[PDB]
Amino acid sequence: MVLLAAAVCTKAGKAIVSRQFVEMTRTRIEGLLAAFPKLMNTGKQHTFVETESVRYVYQPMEKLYMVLITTKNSNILEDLETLRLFSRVIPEYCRALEENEISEHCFDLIFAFDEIVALGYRENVNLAQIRTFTE
Amino acid sequence: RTLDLPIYVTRVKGNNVYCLDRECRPRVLTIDPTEFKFKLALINRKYDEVLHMVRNAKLVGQSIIAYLQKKGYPEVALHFVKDEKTRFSLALECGNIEIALEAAKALDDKNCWEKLGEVALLQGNHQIVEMCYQRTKNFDKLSFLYLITGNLEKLRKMMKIAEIRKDMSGHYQNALYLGDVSERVRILKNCGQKSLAYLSAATHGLDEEAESLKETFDPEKETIPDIDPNAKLLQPPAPIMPLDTNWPLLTV
Amino acid sequence: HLCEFIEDCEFTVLATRILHLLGQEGPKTNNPSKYIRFIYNRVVLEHEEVRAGAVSALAKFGAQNEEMLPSILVLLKRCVMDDDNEVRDRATFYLNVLEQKQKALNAGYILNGLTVSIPGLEKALQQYTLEPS
Amino acid sequence: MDSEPPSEISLKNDLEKGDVKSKTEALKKVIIMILNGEKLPGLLMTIIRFVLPLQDHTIKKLLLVFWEIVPKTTPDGRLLHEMILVCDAYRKDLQHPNEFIRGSTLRFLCKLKEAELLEPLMPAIRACLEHRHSYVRRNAVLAIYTIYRNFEHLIPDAPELIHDFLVNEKDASCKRNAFMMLIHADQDRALDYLSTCIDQVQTFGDILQLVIVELIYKVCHANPSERARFIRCIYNLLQSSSPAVKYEAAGTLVTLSSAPTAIKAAAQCYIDLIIKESDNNVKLIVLDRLVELKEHPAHERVLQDLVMDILRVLSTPDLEVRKKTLQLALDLVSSRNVEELVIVLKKEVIKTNNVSEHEDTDKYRQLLVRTLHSCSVRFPDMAANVIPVLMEFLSDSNEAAAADVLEFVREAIQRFDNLRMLIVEKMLEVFHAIKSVKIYRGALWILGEYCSTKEDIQSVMTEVRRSLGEIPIVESEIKKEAGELKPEEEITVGPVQKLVTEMGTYATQSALSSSRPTKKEEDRPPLRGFLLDGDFFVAASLATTLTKIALRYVALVQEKKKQNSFVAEAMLLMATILHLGKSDPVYAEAYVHVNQYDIVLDVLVVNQTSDTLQNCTLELATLGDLKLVEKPSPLTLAPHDFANIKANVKVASTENGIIFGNIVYDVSGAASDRNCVVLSDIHIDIMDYIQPATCTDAEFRQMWAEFEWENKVTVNTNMTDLNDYLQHILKSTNMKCLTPEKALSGYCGFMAANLYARSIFGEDALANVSIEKPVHQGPDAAVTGHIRIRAKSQGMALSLGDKINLSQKKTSL
Amino acid sequence: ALQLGELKIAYQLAVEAESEQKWKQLAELAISKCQFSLAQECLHHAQDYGGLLLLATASGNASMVNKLAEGAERDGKNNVAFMSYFLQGKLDACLELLIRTGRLPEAAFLARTYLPSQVSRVVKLWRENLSKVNQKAAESLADPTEYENLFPGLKE
């Protein structure tokens, strides 16, 4: 792992759906996402912002944050690129971000998270690839 | 003892203490021979009495098992020594660090070995210091200590195991400290310090080794620095037959 | 004690009062060191008239009490109680008279270290009309 | 189901229903409640039963999902086996013709470091040995590596199964798509293979090769990945005096301060640095390279200096960029700071030239005069420039505009003795139209000191002396001033002697001279007339009089150390000042013990009673900022049990909803009304909750101003200095003694500590401990100290006030 | 001047008082050419006590090695110091370095080694130091009773 979790957040003060690749961040996932994404991840409208010693990468969509978190890093381009591919995959499942529709497609999003980032290493995904799985 | 409610002592008349609170519900408590006997006994320097006295109604952590490691001439300290730390402490307070090394060991730690080794040098004996200092890896401190101590055999052991570290104020020392300088010459050769190796060697009249270093590396040995490059180095090493690793002691 | 309040919002006037009074009495009732420490901070961030007041007071404070001279020197060398603007001019004079000169002048000048004017008791009449307005 | 922890009974019902959608939704609802962290094992048999063999991917994918986030915990429908209900019929899943189900299965199966699934994950690499996508081959190198991680560092995971077992990492290098999960601990042959791959790259894959093996001999060979490493490699091959001219660092760097002025301000800094490496005196700090954009040829077209002018700023771009820019003008070009500060100041300071640089607010004008003038005091060359510019400042000819001008220049003359003779005649001019103090003060000082030079003085002074405006402070300044320099060298209808007469009247005397002075009664109470009245021993003549004083400067006056100076350009300084730079019966006995730096609250729990207390449990609680690092764990407190139970303690936490008192300790036992009782172990205070923080003199000063600290007490046992009892006690009410607020000498020398804390109470805490230790014949109260205290509504002020007396606890059980 | 290999010109350019960075570059260049002489001077101007000693303590007469280690004695850079002083059978400030640091036992020990019987005083000063530095069972205040041994216990 380099990538702790890949997480979709609502800044309602909770992690709406999230993925723990291997059992580590269960409950931990919700508290991080709930506090930090509310402040714009503590950002200023900057894609990288780091708070409480955890790197948060994000994109705001409505009252929701699509969030990538790492606390270690292998390369600059890479962290954005998994988030980015995630952002192609997320409106296919939920038609933008929105807590109720995100909630309903926990399975869809979660499965994509496992597929996209496997054991914290950023694999690649695409909307057609996603189909074989949810078929 | 603790009660389960906040309370006011009504007063003490007799062994009991009696209490009533704001609402005025009572609590009574017999004054025990628990905590009281233990320290009445320890004060009157009884440790034999105190072992019975030790119960789990008064054991705590530091009133029996580590409060008794609080004498600079150990008395209480001797009795409780069960913690590897309390054992360490006990040793410096006596000044006999034989116990220290073991506590220091059981504390699994280097720092303790160097600090007890220093205390050791203070009681006077350097065998004990060597052992400690060797395993903290202060071969260079040892190298320094060693002519001071008057050993030459031990002083050589330090030189090699400080050679490899390239401690230039460790490996370097010992050659000076024995009457001939040859030890340096090889260590310095391995450092690649050919100049330094030649100067050291040359002065002792080991011009041949000095030359080897020049020949392997850049030559020019002719130069005379602000120090001599060829003037006699010879020292008579340690006139003492019994060394100060064998510093005498009786110990009180 | 009152000076403990607020460092520079307390105003030019309170600092001027503790300063003027500490200068003039030359406390042996309490140690002047608290007073001096309190005034020293206030001067930095408050108006010219008090900072100028503080140097001149210190000088009179010197002339009346010998003891005091060491504090005068730490205060006056500072960029505050001297070397600001008005504070500098008064200070250059007051300092030079204490430091340099005989102090015939300094001695003469302190008669207690009194105020600049002695009026009547102004407050009470003012207060009478002002309250039910 | 966003997060609803009680819903597990409905999920079981929904999980099998004969409708596939409902089953999927149910299993989905389980996933979302676990991820948040909520109840899940009740369901297990139901969950597992529909999905198991099928090639129908969606339920299978859903079940596959739930096996990587909780498989181990849930056991109703799974239990413990080698071929669990996670993988038994998921060997089918692995061996389906559809790549997705196999691929997914492979991917979760190998992901687990589970030992109850170690065997089923090993030939699970079969599912992706054939590579129908880039995803399949990547999935495979990552899964073999994850198998290697899961207890197979030896021969179970290292060779090939039929094509990969730790060999996709080799294969990937030469195949069309790359990805190397080989970062650590894996085949040497693949590492070598990645190097070859640098050339025949796949770009995502190149970032994977590259985390493992970096540094190239080339320029590049292509793609962002190689490119990103490359700027790292370049900085190596030329470290020397920063990067100077930023490499491929520039692209990320802008976003690093997207909020918005700060980027330009930063950019301006680098551009200034880059221009040249100058002398590097006080605010001449430009590093980087000496020549790379030079400075100052006379054949260079359209020159370097055009960019240098931007940096000279009034605000010419916006304030953040302005503060950076003023420092940056100073930094490329000056002598120190002085040269370019005078030019810069000339532009800023008030004139008759431009009315976009003059303003009728007196302090700013004055400050600007002092900034220009401080440059002279710093450096000589500037004296010559400053005085004529100062006369232009005067020429504005508003009462106030003259006034500010006169005030600094007069200070300059104290420094600059009979050098500024020339200015006096200009300075008189605007002294007649008057509505303020300042003009009178300053003018009277110039005209006064300068008398030898001029002869006008009865005429100039007299219009003002019989004119009105505001005159308090006028008195002080005219008092030391009016006679000075040469005894009889003036005359218009009042020579220098009339002036000494006048000077004395204005100070506090009375005399017809200059048609009488405006006022006589002096400024602030201490000043009075008398010193100067005594003075003028030799009538206004350079000797040992007013003239001496006037043509001399009080203490050292040099530089921009603020000794007749003001420290750069007045507007830039406001910003720098702002910058604070802050850095059921139960019996308990107890003591706190420390062994091998483990801090524990020892508790002994005692049942003196014959009665039953079984059901005995022991807990240490989290009250607020107090916390258990592990409660006492024995099931003790039984009929006539004495036990020693250790509860570990922490002091730092986050507020819990239960009570906030001393320490809560809970023992449980038999009873059904008071099954749980709260009983105490020894004292811990409310004070713990405060959090220590520190201040510097600027933060302390700011906070002093910010909110009142009038409140004081005198605390006994502050006989001692700051360092001893007072620090230790102050520490326990999470405070710390930092910077001073003292003024020590032979009469002064109370010890002063500036305290700070930032309490978890919605307040800060500050105090000053003044220790009244006698340095005078009349101390306050002798040894003892008065602590002047505050907090932000002074609710913690009080804590400081009494927790600096004494404080000690001990027991000896 | 370094490039040309003009040591002297590089030496003027450094300038004898400070510019230690210049001198350290020059000192290494001087050692390379095996011109020890220029090197000893560069190292002096550089100061470089640890390095300077290595070139310098190769003397065998300690000719210019004490100065560059005078500090070292009392800085706890004892090691640098011992090599300086003990180099031709002389006790130049060997003992002294040991006293200065507070490594008093080691001065006693040295004194025994070369026996001018100075040991009696060093052992005493040291023994006293044990009593102050909390030892009671090895307290040392005796002549051989409480651990350590003053000179009559000792011998050549």
UniProtKB/Swiss-Prot annotation, chain A:
Q: Where in the cell is it found?
A: Cytoplasm; Golgi apparatus membrane; Cytoplasmic vesicle, COPI-coated vesicle membrane
Q: Which superkingdom, per the lineage?
A: Eukaryota
According to its UniProt record, which protein family does this protein belong to?
A: Belongs to the adaptor complexes medium subunit family. Delta-COP subfamily.
Q: What does the function comment of this entry state?
A: The coatomer is a cytosolic protein complex that binds to dilysine motifs and reversibly associates with Golgi non-clathrin-coated vesicles, which further mediate biosynthetic protein transport from the ER, via the Golgi up to the trans Golgi network. Coatomer complex is required for budding from Golgi membranes, and is essential for the retrograde Golgi-to-ER transport of dilysine-tagged proteins.
Q: How does it assemble?
A: Oligomeric complex that consists of at least the alpha, beta, beta', gamma, delta, epsilon and zeta subunits.
**Protein name per the record:** Coatomer subunit delta
Swiss-Prot record, chain C:
Compartments in which it is found: Cytoplasm, Cytosol; Golgi apparatus membrane; Cytoplasmic vesicle, COPI-coated vesicle membrane
Give TM regions: none
Q: Tell me the disulfide pairings in this chain.
A: none
Self-association and partners: Oligomeric complex that consists of at least the alpha, beta, beta', gamma, delta, epsilon and zeta subunits. Interacts with ZNF289/ARFGAP2 through its C-terminal appendage domain. Interacts with EGFR upon EGF treatment; interaction is essential for regulation of EGF-dependent nuclear transport of EGFR by retrograde trafficking from the Golgi to the ER. The coatomer interacts with KDEL receptors; the interaction is important for retrograde trafficking of KDEL-bearing proteins from the Golgi to the endoplasmic reticulum. Interacts with COPB1. Interacts with TMED10 (via C-terminus).
Family named by the database record: Belongs to the COPG family.
Q: What does this protein's UniProt record list under function?
A: The coatomer is a cytosolic protein complex that binds to dilysine motifs and reversibly associates with Golgi non-clathrin-coated vesicles, which further mediate biosynthetic protein transport from the ER, via the Golgi up to the trans Golgi network. Coatomer complex is required for budding from Golgi membranes, and is essential for the retrograde Golgi-to-ER transport of dilysine-tagged proteins.
What name goes with this protein? Coatomer subunit gamma-1
Classification from the root reads:
Eukaryota, Metazoa, Chordata, Craniata, Vertebrata
Curated annotation (Swiss-Prot), chain D:
PTM info: Proteolytically cleaved between Ser-513 and Ser-514 by CAPN8.
Question: Where in the cell?
Answer: Cytoplasm; Golgi apparatus membrane; Cytoplasmic vesicle, COPI-coated vesicle membrane; Cell membrane
Q: What does this protein do?
A: The coatomer is a cytosolic protein complex that binds to dilysine motifs and reversibly associates with Golgi non-clathrin-coated vesicles, which further mediate biosynthetic protein transport from the ER, via the Golgi up to the trans Golgi network. Coatomer complex is required for budding from Golgi membranes, and is essential for the retrograde Golgi-to-ER transport of dilysine-tagged proteins.
Q: Which Gene3D superfamilies match?
A: Leucine-rich Repeat Variant (1.25.10.10)
* Predominant cellular place of this UniProt entry's protein: cytoplasm
Entry comment describing in which tissues the protein is expressed: Predominantly expressed in the upper one-third of the oxyntic mucosa and in most regions of the pyloric mucosa. Ubiquitously expressed including platelet, liver, heart, spleen, lung and kidney.
Q: Any idea which UniProt keywords this protein has? A: Acetylation, Cell membrane, Cytoplasm, Cytoplasmic vesicle, ER-Golgi transport, Golgi apparatus, Membrane, Protein transport, Repeat, Transport
This protein's GO cellular component annotations are: COPI vesicle coat; COPI-coated vesicle; cytosol; endoplasmic reticulum-Golgi intermediate compartment; Golgi apparatus; Golgi membrane; plasma membrane
HEAT repeats, residue ranges = 81-116, 117-153, 225-261, 262-299, 301-338, 381-418
> Biological process (GO) annotations?
intra-Golgi vesicle-mediated transport; intracellular protein transport
Which GO terms label this protein's molecular function in UniProt?
A: structural molecule activity
Swiss-Prot record, chain E:
User: What effect does gene inactivation have here?
Assistant: The knockout of the gene results in early embryonic lethality with no viable embryos recovered at 12.5 dpc.
The WD repeat ranges on this chain: 99-136
Q: Which parts pass through the membrane? A: none
Which cellular compartments is it found in?
Cytoplasm, Cytosol; Golgi apparatus membrane; Cytoplasmic vesicle, COPI-coated vesicle membrane
* Physiological role: The coatomer is a cytosolic protein complex that binds to dilysine motifs and reversibly associates with Golgi non-clathrin-coated vesicles, which further mediate biosynthetic protein transport from the ER, via the Golgi up to the trans Golgi network. Coatomer complex is required for budding from Golgi membranes, and is essential for the retrograde Golgi-to-ER transport of dilysine-tagged proteins.
| Subunit structure, interactors included | Oligomeric complex that consists of at least the alpha, beta, beta', gamma, delta, epsilon and zeta subunits. Probably interacts with PEX11A. Interacts with SCYL1. Interacts with JAGN1.
Q: Which family does it belong to?
A: Belongs to the WD repeat COPB2 family.
| Name used for this protein in its record | Coatomer subunit beta'
Q: Which gene does this sequence derive from?
A: Copb2
